Amino acid sequence: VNPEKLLVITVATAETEGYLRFLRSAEFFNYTVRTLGLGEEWRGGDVARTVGGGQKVRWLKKEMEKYADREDMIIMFVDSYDVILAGSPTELLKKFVQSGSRLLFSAESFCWPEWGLAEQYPEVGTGKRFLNSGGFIGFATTIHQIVRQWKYKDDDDDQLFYTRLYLDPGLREKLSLNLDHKSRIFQNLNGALDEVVLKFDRNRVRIRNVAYDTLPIVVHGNGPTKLQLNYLG
Numbered sequence: 532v533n534p535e536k537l538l539v540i541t542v543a544t545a546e547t548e549g550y551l552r553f554l555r556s557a558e559f560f561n562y563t564v565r566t567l568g569l570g571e572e573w574r575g576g577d578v579a580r581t582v583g584g585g586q587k588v589r590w591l592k593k594e595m596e597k598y599a600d601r602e603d604m605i606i607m608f609v610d611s612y613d614v615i616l617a618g619s620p621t622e623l624l625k626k627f628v629q630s631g632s633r634l635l636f637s638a639e640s641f642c643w644p645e646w647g648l649a650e651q652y653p654e655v656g657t658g659k660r661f662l663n664s665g666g667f668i669g670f671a672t673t674i675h676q677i678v679r680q681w682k683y684k685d686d687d688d689d690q691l692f693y694t695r696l697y698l699d700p701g702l703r704e705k706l707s708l709n710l711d712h713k714s715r716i717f718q719n720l721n722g723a724l725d726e727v728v729l730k731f732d733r734n735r736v737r738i739r740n741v742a743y744d745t746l747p748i749v750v751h752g753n754g755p756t757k758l759q760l761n762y763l764g
């Protein structure tokens with residue numbers, strides 16, 4: 532795929548140190564970023580809370596209306612305060628084509644926020660079983676068909692919304708939704724610190740996942756792992 536057809540969309544209500552860390556990594560690798568929400572009031576829930584972020588989906592829904600018909604375009608959505616990018620657009624798109632997915636979500640060890648949904652997920656052996664909405668990549672048309680279904684409160688949970696759609700077998704089959712079970716593109720660090728090591732790559736520090744033997748592009752220092760991102764770059 533042509534990197535000119537990839538857009539990275541993120542949300543930031545302020546230019547925090549985390550957002551600037553994200554943005555520097557994106558610019559170093561020559562990604563094109565679209566940032567939603569700068570200077571707006573965050574309504575996604577008190578940052579202490581372990582659920583929320585629906586405002587992100589509402590803003591993404593509005594932006595995706597521009598791309599509803601762009602069959603050529605690939606969009607990666609990521610959190611920005613606790614994410615860094617560690618490889619090139621060419622590497623990312625090669626791995627995306629290899630996934631065979633039209634919308635690939637990051638995966639994690641914990642079924643959150645509704646533990647009772649865990650039984651509805653396919654069992655996948657040693658891979659990461661559950662959906663995490665801090666990063667996903669897919670065709671713009673497919674993403675629009677997902678986010679246009681958002682009709683909830685700004686402090687409702689984004690992850691629960693995407694989870695319930697992913698868990699609908701008919702929809703998952705029709706739209707070709709998938710999870711990145713072996714952290715080939717997305718590395719969620721919460722629940723996987725025992726799996727990762729630092730690796731020098733052209734005088735940059737990135738992550739190798741030694742459990743799956745992968746070199747993820749997107750590193751998400753979610754939950755209490757946020758400070759681990761300061762070793763990368």
Ligand SMILES: O=c1ccn([C@@H]2O[C@H](COP(=O)(O)OP(=O)(O)O)[C@@H](O)[C@H]2O)c(=O)[nH]1
Binds near residue numbers: 753
């Ligand atoms: O005041 C805020 C809080 C959050 N965010 C955005 O919402 C994302 C989700 O927040 P967090 O990473 O804490 O969520 P979690 O990874 O725990 O679901 C952040 O990375 C930012 O992109 C924002 O723009 N402003």
Ligand SMILES: [Mg+2]
Binds near residue numbers: 581
């Ligand atoms: Mg969350």
Ligand SMILES: [Mn+2]
Binds near residue numbers: 613
């Ligand atoms: Mn996050």
